[PDB]
Amino acid sequence: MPIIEQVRAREILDSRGNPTVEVEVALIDGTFARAAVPSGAATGEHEAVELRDGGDRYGGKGVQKAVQAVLDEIGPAVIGLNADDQRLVDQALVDLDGTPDKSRLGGNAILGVSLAVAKAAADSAELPLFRYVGGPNAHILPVPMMNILNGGAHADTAVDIQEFMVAPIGAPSFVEALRWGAEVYHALKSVLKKEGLSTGLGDEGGFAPDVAGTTAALDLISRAIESAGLRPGADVALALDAAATEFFTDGTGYVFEGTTRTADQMTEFYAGLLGAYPLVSIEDPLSEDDWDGWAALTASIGDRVQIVGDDIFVTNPERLEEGIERGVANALLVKVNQIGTLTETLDAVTLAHHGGYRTMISHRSGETEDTMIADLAVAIGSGQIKTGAPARSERVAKYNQLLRIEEALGDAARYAGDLAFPR
Amino acid sequence: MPIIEQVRAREILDSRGNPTVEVEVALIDGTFARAAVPSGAATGEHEAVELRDGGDRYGGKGVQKAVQAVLDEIGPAVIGLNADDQRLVDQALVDLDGTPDKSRLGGNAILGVSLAVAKAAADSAELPLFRYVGGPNAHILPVPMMNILNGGAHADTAVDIQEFMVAPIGAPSFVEALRWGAEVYHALKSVLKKEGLSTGLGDEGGFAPDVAGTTAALDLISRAIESAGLRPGADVALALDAAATEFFTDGTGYVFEGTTRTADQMTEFYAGLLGAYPLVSIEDPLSEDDWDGWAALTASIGDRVQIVGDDIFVTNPERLEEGIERGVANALLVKVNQIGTLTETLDAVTLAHHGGYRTMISHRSGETEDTMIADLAVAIGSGQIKTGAPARSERVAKYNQLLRIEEALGDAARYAGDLAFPR
Amino acid sequence: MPIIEQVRAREILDSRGNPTVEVEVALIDGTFARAAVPSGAATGEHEAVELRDGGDRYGGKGVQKAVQAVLDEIGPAVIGLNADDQRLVDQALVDLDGTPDKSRLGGNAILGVSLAVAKAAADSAELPLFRYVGGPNAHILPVPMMNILNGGAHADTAVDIQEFMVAPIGAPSFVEALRWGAEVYHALKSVLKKEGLSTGLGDEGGFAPDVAGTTAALDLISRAIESAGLRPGADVALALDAAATEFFTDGTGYVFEGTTRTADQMTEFYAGLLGAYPLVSIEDPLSEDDWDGWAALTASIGDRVQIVGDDIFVTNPERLEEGIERGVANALLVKVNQIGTLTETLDAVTLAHHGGYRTMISHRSGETEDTMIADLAVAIGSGQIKTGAPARSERVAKYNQLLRIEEALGDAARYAGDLAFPR
Amino acid sequence: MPIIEQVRAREILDSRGNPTVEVEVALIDGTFARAAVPSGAATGEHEAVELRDGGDRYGGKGVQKAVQAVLDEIGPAVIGLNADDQRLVDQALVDLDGTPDKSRLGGNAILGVSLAVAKAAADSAELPLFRYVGGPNAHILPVPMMNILNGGAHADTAVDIQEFMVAPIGAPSFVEALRWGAEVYHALKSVLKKEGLSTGLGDEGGFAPDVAGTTAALDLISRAIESAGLRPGADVALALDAAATEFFTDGTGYVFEGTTRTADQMTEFYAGLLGAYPLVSIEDPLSEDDWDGWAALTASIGDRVQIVGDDIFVTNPERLEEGIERGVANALLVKVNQIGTLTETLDAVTLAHHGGYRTMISHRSGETEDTMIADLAVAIGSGQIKTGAPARSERVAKYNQLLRIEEALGDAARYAGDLAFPR
Ligand SMILES: O=C(O)[C@@H](CO)OP(=O)(O)O
Ligand SMILES: O=C(O)[C@@H](CO)OP(=O)(O)O
Ligand SMILES: O=C(O)[C@@H](CO)OP(=O)(O)O
Ligand SMILES: O=C(O)[C@@H](CO)OP(=O)(O)O
Ligand SMILES: [Mg+2]
Ligand SMILES: [Mg+2]
Ligand SMILES: [Mg+2]
Ligand SMILES: [Mg+2]
């Protein structure tokens, strides 16, 4: 039987070189699964507490504290439970911690176990992770949202918008879809060389040049698309993570490209681009708690584009429900480590999906070699994934895993294609 | 490995005493699963072709024809395939048949194999059917929609509306929820005795008295609710399957309670009841192809009540998509045998769920001892099921299986309760 | 038994976003191993032929050609052989190709199989890859040579020397050793910020600022070491890959920092630094075929520093033997993909090790999520590894795997420390 | 799993008829391995303490004392440990003893367990001992150094030099190599008969005639080579173990063939022979602690011949390191029982091999039916073995095991041939 028999945990380095939690689970039937926990550069206020060691080591960013929680407290608590009772294991961890924000054991320890338990469950079931999580109907390969020009907090550059990504919605398959993104990325490299701009990479592996403004970046991407013999829009669409939390002052407003601006001021600018450019998606265009601004933007342009809530929802059913009720955004960015457990994440997906909202499975600035979200994207049938550029193997590894799932699925597999966005 | 090794099929009797298809699947690892196929009394035009033998036997309702298709054609075609590649097995069956409406091998043969393969997959995975189909997050026990007064085609009575059902939305758990329905049903029995009306059962095990009109029935149910020491609405809500296809004349209109009436005429009457009674759901209030009428009813009262499409969608993504586009209804009645495969069914659920529509897993007038839909309701997290009265074990068996799933889930389990209907 | 039963191969993306070969091997005992093949940005002339597709796809850098070789030719050839007869499998592949430079099937296909077969062997033996390859005595954790400032071909910058790396020789353990490098890297980030220089990353995840000269870079690294509260030399030493092939003109000489210079000219400059800075290692200081220059440099400063042959030996026993005979260099850079097989690599290690030469296991500019070389470094007991910065998970993943091996080894484990370099 | 479950030990007779330690190890997975411990006639001062019983039995040479140590102390200490964690098991034994020279439990008990554990590890891994110890690259069959004329302490004759051996360096394979030695040995038998000299065997199974001097012996061997239709040098080379410890007086000098002589006196004589005869190797030409003499001999003739350290290094990394530093000898004679553990032995090999020194795996005057060193020679890829004459099955058994390894390896196998000695 798949009965949890051993829970070990160790400290490893994420893609930025910062420590994080890796968890290992053994079942009485000799199953061995391993899950590693990502970390965002700038984390939203309402995220689950990341338990850091503090002090001298790794500039206080150590997670030995979180590792001992797993060995000392969680292991003893879940050992004896059944690995395929995810909700019961997840509820035990949540109850063991006993805090709203998972501040006792840490979301990074809690999730470490949540994910490792899920992988062990699927190995023991002799099912690939996407098939076990999403059932036998898991088959929709997602549109890669590939962040090829990096700004905001993932770059030490003076670019305001955090992510500029390409969406090969026109591709007939994932294998072609991934080729297109790759081929556009390499094109952009040459474009940036031609214009004498920087090709040093940011955190998610996009190029980090000191472009003048938002227009200028999108123009360079469009060039790159065309240079790669693809048509902007129909073949390859555009997307943003504005991340307007990281350039919003509590109460005051948004300090954005010279002029400190209102949500309505901003809302006009975003509408402008929908005109100029082939944008299918805009994420965190306004601040985490600027609830008024989002409703107006959503009311204004929601018919015309996909609006993705990241820091406003922090993958939280509580925050998401308020959103749905107030008609804030049409899509949820899904980040396991924001909420802290797999079941809390899927509850969030389920709420969004039942509320007619789309979902986009997301990585963090600090990723590991873990490919968990690759399977999660297909399992939940989101048809959209944001796991960074076609550069840096903490991003690429997910795309490689998506290739494998597509292979495994054979004729069963369908690429979400342009069906991901009605508008 | 879970590789299909043997496919046998035989003819059995459904709950009406009519033959139907039962399928058995063996995997190379010695897994043995069995699935039986239901049949509706009056089937919608756009349903999958049920392959009947014709001739003298069982008044032409034999399925020996369909049984040989399984032995002779399907067995040889799927043997060697992997049981947990549901979509690949389902696609092979669909391609082998090679017709739009599954008229070659018959939906009843095709589905027989589709479901048996799915059950074998789950046994081999050592997972309960709901866990394998819906993943580890399957936990939402559905609200039983219990049809305790039978009219229309399930009764040889002069009652116009086909189904009158009770919805114990107020119950804290499924185990209590099922008790309430049972206790209300037995109360209604005594009420009908008191009023000297009939307690002979219809097809779905509801009482089939010759009540004057629609009002009169709902009044008797309300009595019964109150007599059982429960509060109508808050504890126990009301629901209908109008089945207005079975009393609509192509082009003319709806011959309903004396007066042949327009969709707008009808629409006024339905709105009337929402006022008089605590209705959470109304199903097939207008005809299968009366596309104009549904839009007006949906526009009119859709804010005020759940509108369920049965014969208008026949569990067909094609028909459902047109509905969503034309804003026809807010919920899909899910019937595996209308569409013909498990994967086609789940595609339909997925379309509805992504379009912000609710889903209600449904039985047929002709049911078997099969409890498949009990698991399917929890797997898809619909939170609503219509599997008939708390009488006749072709209905009860599903409720017994729902009790078992609730047990298995323990603290994980949550009863959909009043969360199934916002309004 | 561990008898090769299935060989599958697919095309994936390396860390630059370029396609490469991934191979999967199944044994009759149901073992499943996967190995992925790296690729260097600028490859030495004498490396094994990388079989590229050419044409439009991935700017001609596709490897579908190589994938079919595996499926069509290699699979049929090795299936039936014993996975733990590495030399026999490797010899079969070499003979099947039948060319000096592996130009028929491609080193990238050949090696794909060589490595996958080795991993399957170790799984079947129930041994970690390092234990199976290096026997029960494999225990020496290597000194991480961490390339934290990137120039040459891994950067679109005007820096002449390709790699600037830090060597935490003073650390008591790998776990501390990796912390030091990480902590120094993050320090350098802050230093570069302070000096207003670029922190956009190069191919191996080092910072790619447009530093004036070689001195200036080494000075910034030393700052960073000191800023991290470690002592340059005793705690953290310095190392270079000059990669003088990529700035040498056939017959003419080396175009290096303004002045086109002789091997003797260069040799004086390198000796200068040994004075100024705490350098333990200098790699490819002169050109691949500049055999005369290396002897003089080796004669001149070989007593004073470790000289590492990369492109001069291309992991080739043939090239290495000439070197040993002519007393060219004191160390071999080991790259599996230069030579094409695991056994050819180990022959090369064995020649070097028996000739009193040290060995440094190396990655490529294009790496995958594969951690194979992490195990290989410990198995061969080199005590030195170059797998890039503590940034980008195609580098970090190896360091994470080295942490795991150190854990597994417990008290058995010894960190090579300052014992890696006598001088 | 390969977890040590039982350690039994018993007293057996070596090839001289003296008791020694035999150890048996059982793993929880029902693996059964047996290792027997050799003993040298005259042991170097710096060897590990051989724990002898003393008293009446076997003239005090009993090892019941050592057997009880295994049963009473070591068994309980290592039971529960993992057999393939050699270094951890070896370190436990070393720590349990807790003395520099293994004088508490005895090297003969300690090693008994060290070797038995290693064999059990390899059985459980389902790998031949050479493959498990040396990894998949173990393939180099060693040159047999066959001691066919015995003097010194292995003979009750008046011959000064201890070993006169033949080296079939010219052979194309081990199977031919062993034939040549055998055929030369039988030839020497006939030569000795012709000259009316003795053919009674010494301890290692070489002929023990009372030859006049060192020249006279080498002349008889050369005759024998030629009589066997092989060419001295190119086909069959010559080698000595001078064993100058057993004819050196502390402080005074070496009493050798009439004249008590200086290290420089001796050094001239050895140089003389290199001229007269085809010698590839000379072992313990000077005394164990005569550190000055070895440096001069090594400086003098080290370019011209292989110098093997036996009693000077006693297979001790400590003693070997001093040697390497002082440039004493170019090769290490490897004897497991001198150092006391397999891991301490391999550390010694590793030091020598990384210092550019060759290694020769050696037996003892007192050998058992054990063939362990046959595998060890191939695992460490020494390409040289000294396991005595082609007579007496305590020698021959090793050659028979080398034949089997060569068979197993097939085309993988390479005979070290004349590649063992550059000079
Ligand atoms: O803004 C976001 O969506 C994420 C990137 O996936 O940012 P961070 O990981 O820094 O929280
Ligand atoms: O109208 C319906 O929903 C069904 C009852 O489940 O009717 P029939 O089975 O007769 O098609
Ligand atoms: O020069 C080197 O050693 C390598 C980096 O490991 O370079 P490339 O991978 O580009 O050949
Ligand atoms: O001198 C030696 O090398 C050995 C023989 O292998 O001698 P003894 O076994 O007597 O120590
Ligand atoms: Mg954001
Ligand atoms: Mg109906
Ligand atoms: Mg180089
Ligand atoms: Mg000796």
Author numbering:
A (entry chain A), B (entry chain A), C (entry chain A), D (entry chain A): 1 to 423
Show the paper's wording.
Enolase, a ubiquitous enzyme, catalyzes the reversible conversion of 2-phospho­glycerate (2PG) to phospho­enolpyruvate (PEP) in the glycolytic pathway of organisms of all three domains of life. Here we present structural snapshots of Mycobacterium tuberculosis (Mtb) enolase in apo, PEP-bound and two 2PG-bound forms as it catalyzes the conversion of PEP to 2PG. MtEno has a topology similar to other enolase structures, a smaller N-terminal domain and a larger C-terminal domain. The crystal and the cryoEM structures (enzyme in solution, frozen) along with the biochemical studies clearly demonstrate that the functional unit of MtEno is an octamer.
Tautomerization resonance is accelerated on acidification of the carboxyl group of 2PG which is accomplished through its lone-pair-mediated coordination with both the Mg2+ ions and the transfer of a proton from His154 onto the nearest oxygen linked to the phosphate moiety. To find out if the exact reverse of this reaction occurs during the conversion of PEP to 2PG, we systematically mutated each of the residues Ser42, Asp241, Glu163, Glu204 and Lys335 to alanine, compared their activity with wild type MtEno, and elucidated the structures of three of them [Figs. 4(a) and 4(b)]. Notably, the K335A mutation disrupts the nucleophilic (proton) substitution, the E204A mutation defuncts enolation capacity, D241A should make the MgA 2+ coordination in the active site highly improbable and S42A should absolve the MgB 2+ coordination. We analyzed the solvent accessibility in the protein structure based on tunnels and channels buried in the core of the protein by employing CAVER. The water-accessibility channel tunnel of the MtEno S42A–2PG co-crystal structure was similar to that of MtEno Wt-2PG [Figs. 4(d) and 4(e)], corroborating our annotation of the substrate being 2PG. On the other hand, MgB 2+ was absent, possibly owing to the role of Ser42 in MgB 2+ coordination. However, conversion of PEP to 2PG even in its absence indicated that MgB 2+ may be non-obligatory for the reverse reaction. Moreover, the activity of MtEno–S42A is considerably reduced (∼5% of MtEno WT enzyme) but not completely abolished unlike other mutant enzymes which were non-functional [Fig. 4(b)]. Based on these results, it is plausible that, while MgB 2+ aids in the tautomerization, the presence of MgA 2+ makes its presence partially redundant.
